[PDB]
Amino acid sequence: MQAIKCVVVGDVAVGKTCLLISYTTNAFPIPTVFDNYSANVMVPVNLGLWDTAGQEDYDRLRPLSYPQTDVFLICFSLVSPASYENVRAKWFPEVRHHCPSTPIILVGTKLDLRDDKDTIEKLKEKKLAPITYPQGLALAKEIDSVKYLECSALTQRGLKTVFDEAIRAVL
Ligand SMILES: Nc1nc2c(ncn2[C@@H]2O[C@H](COP(=O)(O)OP(=O)(O)OP(=O)(O)O)[C@@H](O)[C@H]2O)c(=O)[nH]1
């Protein structure tokens, strides 16, 4: 019955499309066309999932999707400190400029990779380490997110929670 709009933003390759597709179809992919999806879920809610292009080239046009958004998911890769930094450097500021009062959920992605051997190896070779939970929770508090939630589109762990809370942030 109730219609809720949800826009997903964040650095390219943090897993925004896989996130939305894995949730809407319960399967893990990748479509190149930036699209919007939908889902009927009980929290009666018709959730509209709007994907975005995080590249800089679309900095000016991206925000055209923002108007009338009910809730935002600002995502960052749990195995990418760079995407973590850009949350406060770019995404939180951008969302707030266009939509000052709209609720925000901070989403950590690729949780399945935080414990991955070869992955930790890679980050280590660059003097970097995966974003621990406390760290993610800290950032959420900084930007005053309604909630901080970690998920994995590959295993779908915590996935259902992310969108349930994104909905409860509206109802
Ligand atoms: N291991 C693992 N890899 C993931 C997961 N989610 C996404 N990926 C990988 O991350 C890469 C980024 O995929 P996208 O979903 O397109 O990320 P995105 O750039 O933020 O979203 P779009 O630009 O809209 O496509 C893909 O090659 C996936 O294989 C995950 O949960 N676990």
∠ at Cα 66 (73, 28), nearest 5°? Answer: 40
Ligand 1 atom with minimal separation from the 12 CA: 19
**Residue 154 φ/ψ, nearest 5 degrees:** -75, -40
* Residue 13 beta carbon below 6 angstroms from any ligand 1 atom: yes
- Residue 22 CA to ligand 1 centre (angstroms): 10
Q: The tokens 């009338």 sit on which residue? A: 68
- Residue 149 CA to ligand 1 centre (angstroms): 17
Q: Which domains does the chain have, with CATH numbers?
A: 1-171 (3.40.50.300)
Q: The tokens 């600002």 sit on which residue? A: 74
Ligand 1 atom with minimal separation from the 52 CA: 24
* Residue 12 beta carbon below 6 angstroms from any ligand 1 atom: yes
∠ at Cα 18 (16, 22), nearest 5°? Answer: 125
- Alpha carbon distance 132, 144 (integer Å): 18
∠ at Cα 114 (109, 119), nearest 5°? Answer: 110
- Alpha carbon distance 140, 142 (integer Å): 5
Nearest CA to ligand 1 atom 6: 15
Burial 31-40 (b: 16+ CB within 10 A, else e): eeeeeebeee
β 104-109/71-77 pair status: parallel
Residues 6+ apart with CB under 8 A from 12: 53, 54, 55
Length of the chain: 171
